[PDB]
Design a protein around this ligand. Structure first.
Ligand SMILES: *C[C@@](*)(O)[C@H](CCCNC(N)=[NH2+])NC(=O)[C@@H]1CCCN1C(=O)[C@H](N)Cc1ccccc1
Ligand SMILES: [Ca+2]
Lengths: 51, 235
């Protein structure tokens, strides 16, 4: 998780064998690329959606 | 907010205003549909308070506002253990009926202790509110916001005779002119992490507003995120 947060968009934890597990805050889901966070509810926290 | 600018509607959809024996006396942030996080010094006493989410212009109607009554107030248990220190200046407000989340009414994200502190140390946060726009001057009609840089602890300490605890941080500009101010207390200090905003502070106290050599003082939310999560659970 040392550099660029393991390339996790939100949260990174050190697992084993040099590798990472990313995770996201409530209302988001770990995207299939296993790094990014995607909305899992209609109005997830912390997001501007008015445009 | 001194030296800030007008928010757009929905730009800070976690921001709420508090109304009571004084109108627009403090701000807060939406934790979830039932809970607001604010400053404990805004809600000493069991006097009645209302919360307005989806607020933009406090003298006009936007048809985005949601007004709720506060039925329970939980100041941090160590607030006012020591008088007039403003240590642990943070409180939770439970609403009588859930907010309805929408583009104008949206929670702020709250990371764990480690990541809230990492986000704070990114060093640039947004503060917002309807407080004074000049020191000893009038309050804002339209929500104001301002980006403030984090200030290092030693500089923070030298800037004031009052004590800065490890539950506080400083933010503002070495040259002054831009600051939170009276009426902004309880509102958010937030850090934007790739388009998602996280709560990193609560607007707490200062000496005058926007004076050169002085900084705004903020409650350090990383120290309180376990407590926030414990008390605001939905079931
Ligand atoms: C309750 C909040 O609206 C308010 C926020 C002020 C933020 N100021 C800056 N410059 N960012 N906080 C307060 O009013 C708190 C709690 C009550 C006292 N207080 C202060 O900020 C006083 N100004 C602290 C003080 C300084 C010098 C002498 C006496 C008191
Ligand atoms: Ca309005």
């Amino acid at each position: 998780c040392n550099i660029k947060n393991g390339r996790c968009e939100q949260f990174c934890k050190n697992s084993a064998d040099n590798k990472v597990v990313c995770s996201c805050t409530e209302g988001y889901r770990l995207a299939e690329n296993q790094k990014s966070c995607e909305p899992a509810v209609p109005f997830p926290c912390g997001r501007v959606s008015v445009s | 907010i001194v030296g800030g600018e007008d928010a757009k509607p929905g730009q800070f959809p976690w921001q709420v205003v508090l109304n009571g024996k004084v109108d627009a006396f403090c701000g807060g942030s939406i934790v979830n549909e039932k809970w607001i996080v604010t400053a404990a010094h805004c809600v000493e006493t069991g006097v009645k308070i209302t919360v307005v989410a989806g607020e933009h212009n406090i003298e006009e109607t936007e048809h985005t506002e949601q007004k709720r009554n506060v039925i329970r107030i939980i100041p941090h248990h160590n607030y006012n253990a020591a008088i007039n220190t403003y240590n642990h200046d943070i409180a939770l407000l439970e609403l009588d009926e859930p907010l309805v989340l929408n583009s104008y009414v949206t929670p702020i994200c709250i990371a764990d202790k480690e990541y809230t502190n990492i986000f704070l140390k990114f060093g640039s946060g947004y503060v917002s509110g309807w407080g004074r726009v000049f020191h000893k001057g009038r309050s804002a009609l339209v929500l104001q916001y301002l980006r403030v840089p984090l200030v290092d602890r030693a500089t923070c300490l030298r800037s004031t005779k009052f004590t800065i605890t490890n539950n506080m941080f400083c933010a503002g500009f070495h040259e002054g002119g831009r600051d939170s101010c009276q009426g902004d207390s309880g509102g958010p200090h937030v850090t934007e992490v790739e388009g998602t905003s996280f709560l990193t502070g609560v607007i707490s106290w200062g000496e005058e507003c926007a004076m050169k050599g002085k900084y705004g003082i903020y409650t350090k939310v990383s120290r309180y995120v376990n407590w926030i999560k414990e008390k605001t659970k939905l079931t």
